[PDB]
Amino acid sequence: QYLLPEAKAQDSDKICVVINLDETLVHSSFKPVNNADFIIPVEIDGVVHQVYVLKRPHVDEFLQRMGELFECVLFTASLAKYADPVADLLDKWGAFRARLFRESCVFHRGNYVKDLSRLGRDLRRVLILDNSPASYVFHPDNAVPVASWFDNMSDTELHDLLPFFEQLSRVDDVYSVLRQ
């Protein structure tokens, strides 16, 4: 069936927003860095590798607000062994109602696509924030574009996007503003 169960009573009237992880909220690497926000041990074939994670500027204020405005869902093409621990350390306000990983993506033409149709939500009430356009090729008119982040600590994308989401949380049909 669908990837998500019915929305909880409190989230019924809210628009569902799919939020990507890598290069959107954080940026990670296996290359050691001293200013990492999180260090996550990831076991691969018996070997324990360390992943260094950097948080994107204003990510905390961003997730706290989005959590109040929408039914937030983490959707990533990364493996849970990596993404689940990052989400645990990152989401202190319980913004994420659900989390979907690589297995939930549809591999189509070489790319993992976040097929929003599999969510089980009225697409007129769904938005996706992903740094890679290829992630939503199946639903280009539900997408709220955002630039890929890596380490620019002067970034203000997440902060600057809030007013926009603020007004979208009020519309009845996202297509009315995103054109479709």
Partner: peptide, 5 residues
């Protein structure tokens, strides 16, 4: 890779 390809 465990991260997003």
């Amino acid at each position: 890779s465990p991260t997003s390809p």
